[PDB]
From a paper:
The [name] ([name]) protein is a conserved cell polarity regulator with anti-tumorigenic properties. [name] is an important regulator of cell polarity and acts as a scaffolding protein to mediate a diverse set of cellular signalling pathways via its four [name] domains. The zoonotic Tick-born encephalitis virus [name] encodes for the [name] protein, which has been shown to interact with [name] in a [name] domain dependent manner. In summary, we show that [name] [name] C-terminal PBM binds [name] PDZ3 in order to interact with [name].
To understand the interactions of [name] [name] domain interactions with [name] PBM sequences in more detail we determined crystal structures of [name] PDZ3:[name]_CTN complexes as well as a structure of [name] PDZ3 apo. Binding of [name]_CTN in a non-canonical manner requires no significant change in the [name] PDZ3 domain fold, with a superimposition of both [name] PDZ3 chains yielding an RMSD of 1.15 Å in Chain A and 1.35 Å in Chain B over the Cα backbone atoms. Furthermore, all side chain rotamers of residues involved in the canonical ligand binding groove are identical with those found in PDZ3:[name]_CTN, including His1071PDZ3. No major changes in B-factor distribution for backbone atoms are observed upon [name]_CTN binding.
Residue numbers in the entry:
A (entry chain B): 11 to 19, 22 to 32, 43 to 102
B (entry chain A): 11 to 31, 40 to 102
The structure:
């Protein structure tokens, strides 16, 4: 399954694992935090961030894409 | 939140995927668990973190090191797992 997630972005309230081709996964989600309230779940694979493919991104690149300045923070994730 | 899981590996498909080795939380991350597969029936779940395998620390294990530890000869396959 796939879906687009927009964060109202302040801590994001999630942790991620992986990076370079396993990919980048959400390892922890703070209950009632921003990521949790946005619909992100443990185990989700982050496919893209604001249109930027991160299927093959480094852990540092994934962190940077998520914290970089933007109009709206939008993610594409794959679960199950 | 920490458990000892026994995985009776019988040579068939184990039905899980793992991600090995900013901010990190320790252990080998279980990324995928096939519903009703061997790993699922054994008690493993997505999000779990394998801390050790038969007493061997795998907190810092690479993906292959973790695979080797899970597939090497042993009498029992006992996993130390942290769960949130």
């Amino acid at each position: 399954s796939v879906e687009e997630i927009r964060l109202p972005r302040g801590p994001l309230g999630l942790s991620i694992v992986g990076g370079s081709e396993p990919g980048v996964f959400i390892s922890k989600v703070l209950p009632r935090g921003l990521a949790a309230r946005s619909g992100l779940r443990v185990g989700d694979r982050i496919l893209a961030v604001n249109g930027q493919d991160v299927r093959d991104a480094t852990h540092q690149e994934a962190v940077s894409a998520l914290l970089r300045p933007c109009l709206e923070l939008s993610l594409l994730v794959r679960r199950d």
